[PDB]
Design a protein around this ligand. Sequence first.
Ligand SMILES: [Ca+2]
Ligand SMILES: [Ca+2]
Ligand SMILES: [Ca+2]
Ligand SMILES: [Ca+2]
Ligand SMILES: [Ca+2]
Ligand SMILES: [Ca+2]
Lengths: 66, 66, 66
Amino acid sequence: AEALFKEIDVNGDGAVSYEEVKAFVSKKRAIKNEQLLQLIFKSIDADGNGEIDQNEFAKFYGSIQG
Amino acid sequence: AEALFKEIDVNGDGAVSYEEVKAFVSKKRAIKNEQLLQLIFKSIDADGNGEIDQNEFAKFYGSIQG
Amino acid sequence: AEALFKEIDVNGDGAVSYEEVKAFVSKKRAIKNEQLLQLIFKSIDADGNGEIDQNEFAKFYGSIQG
Ligand SMILES: [Ca+2]
Ligand SMILES: [Ca+2]
Ligand SMILES: [Ca+2]
Ligand SMILES: [Ca+2]
Ligand SMILES: [Ca+2]
Ligand SMILES: [Ca+2]
């Protein structure tokens, strides 16, 4: 894997160190968490204005079905 | 959900933003972790004085059965 | 459990407090995470020089089989 090795190899010296594997696994996890939250947000925000009003919020709930 | 929408809507402007959903999911998780730990503590602290002595600690263990 | 109670009982007063149980569960988790990451690192670092070169990295990948 090429851009992947370069992405992990942050100081660009050809070697992936322990710190770098650790910083990588760490940010990979953070990114995955954001994407899921955003996707959940976007799905509740039915009109896409970027905020959830009490109505959008109301549909979503109901022993959650919405 | 009413007090719930108000609880998430922290700056009180009627709209639940992404930051607020994120701060909410975050503190909800923190609270759930505390409650479980405390419940586990309270259960080991057999006399409720608020500290676990070596005896209370001893029963609890035993390839944990106590 | 003896060294274990002493390990958790950080200020050495004979009683394991809530803070101490919480600090303990916390560092236990951190240690377990490190050990797994290191073991995964060590396994990719096929020659043990302490860094993963593109070759060691390449074997490891392949719809990961290596
Ligand atoms: Ca590097
Ligand atoms: Ca909206
Ligand atoms: Ca708001
Ligand atoms: Ca006690
Ligand atoms: Ca103590
Ligand atoms: Ca190596």
